């Protein structure tokens, strides 16, 4: 069993996307071939949590782990002392810039999780640089779409090859609500069995796409007059958000940020979720894949996705759509006629909560990062 080294500076118990997705994957693998080398911005708080996991945390002693001789002596050191085979770089730049250190260490093999930010880092020549040596010194190379790859596959280069690794769903958490559940929870909020529900959760910004299901509204209500679209999240466009929904005000309930069980029992309840994500910034602001997709669809609610980035590979033609969020129309249409489809929404639902079984449930997540950590090195 090969030993495993993950060298961060996004770790828990700071909140975050990529702190969120190590600690899901870590806890996936057996705990005592998994060593963890992270920094510390709360000492005391760093502590208490790291008294409560079953693996082992080494606490580097600053508040931000850059790639340094001090910090790359200090991994090399942690390598050898603990015999650790893998050296994992959870997050590829610029800290993966340490995969040379790790090899002379004697690591036999180097892997280095890539996200969103590595699209970005595609763009400048000096930082398209910094992914061309990453990628000579890394053996494997994680990615979380197929859209991400063909974005930066050519700054990496030839030499590492490329696992998809996306962050999976808890199915047991994410679950389909009993009929007893989702009737209360639509009483909660001041509804009942009959009203169509459309939920969107997500930060408030432009390229997720409240806007466009805003605008869509007017034929929506128009068709069913009772219907509801629930706006979940927090976020600095809010206020473009409450302007655009003056005219339908009656019919958008902006719900703010809800707490981490009322928000899973509110989209369990839901009818569709929907968020028609698009590229902005230039090609820039894009979805990389969408994890609210996959909660939606363990829920067992119908999907309505965007064509922004990685956000299609999220669903298939039984489990979602996908629609162009500018094309206003079409996204009115579809939700209508969703909504008036409830048997086409049952097999939607069912279709997606089997579908992330099958293929996006922590469980076969974590056996995909097995297999990365525990074959031998080619
Ligand atoms: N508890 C809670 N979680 C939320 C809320 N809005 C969004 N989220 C979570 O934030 C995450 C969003 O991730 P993702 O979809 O990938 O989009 P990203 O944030 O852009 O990367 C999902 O796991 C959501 O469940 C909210 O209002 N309350």
Redesign the pocket.
């Known amino acids: 069993s090969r030993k495993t080294l993950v060298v961060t500076n996004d770790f828990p118990p700071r909140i975050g996307?990529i702190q969120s997705y190590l600690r899901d994957f870590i806890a996936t693998q057996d705990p005592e071939s998994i060593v963890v080398f992270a920094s510390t911005q709360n000492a005391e708080e760093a502590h208490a949590y790291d008294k409560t996991l079953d693996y082992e945390v080494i606490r580097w002693p600053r508040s931000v782990m850059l790639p340094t001789p001090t910090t790359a002596h200090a991994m090399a050191e942690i390598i050898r002392e603990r015999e650790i085979d893998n050296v994992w770089f959870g997050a590829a730049a610029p800290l993966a810039l340490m995969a040379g250190t790790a090899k002379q260490a004697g690591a036999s093999k180097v892997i280095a999780s890539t996200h969103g930010h590595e699209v970005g880092w595609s763009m400048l020549p000096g930082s398209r640089q910094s992914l061309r040596k990453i990628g000579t010194e890394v053996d494997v190379l994680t990615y979380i779409s197929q859209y991400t790859l063909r974005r930066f596959k050519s700054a990496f280069g030839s030499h590492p090859t490329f696992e998809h690794l996306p962050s999976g769903v808890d199915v047991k958490r994410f679950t389909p609500a009993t009929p007893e559940d989702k009737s209360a929870t639509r009483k909660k909020l001041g509804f009942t069995d009959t009203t169509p529900v459309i939920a969107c959760?997500?930060?408030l910004v432009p390229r997720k796409g409240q806007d466009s299901l805003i605008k869509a509204m007017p034929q929506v209500i128009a068709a069913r007059p009772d219907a509801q679209l629930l706006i979940?999240?927090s976020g600095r466009y809010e206020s473009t958000l409450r302007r655009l929904a003056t005219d339908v005000s009656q019919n958008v309930k902006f719900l703010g940020?809800?707490?981490?069980q009322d928000?899973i029992n509110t989209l369990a309840a839901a009818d569709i979720f929907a968020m028609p994500a698009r590229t902005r910034g230039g090609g820039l602001d894009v979805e990389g894949?969408?994890?609210?997709y996959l909660?939606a669809q363990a829920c067992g609610v119908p999907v309505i996705a965007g064509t922004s980035g990685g956000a299609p590979e999220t669903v298939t033609p039984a489990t979602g759509l996908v629609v162009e969020g500018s094309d206003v129309d079409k996204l009115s249409e579809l939700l209508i006629e969703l909504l008036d489809d409830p048997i086409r929404r049952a097999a939607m639902g069912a279709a997606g909560r089997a579908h992330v079984e099958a293929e996006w449930s922590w469980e076969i997540m974590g056996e995909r990062l097995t297999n990365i950590l525990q074959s031998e090195p080619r």
Do not use: P, Q
């Open positions: 996307g959760n997500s930060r979940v999240g940020r809800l707490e981490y928000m894949l969408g994890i609210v909660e």
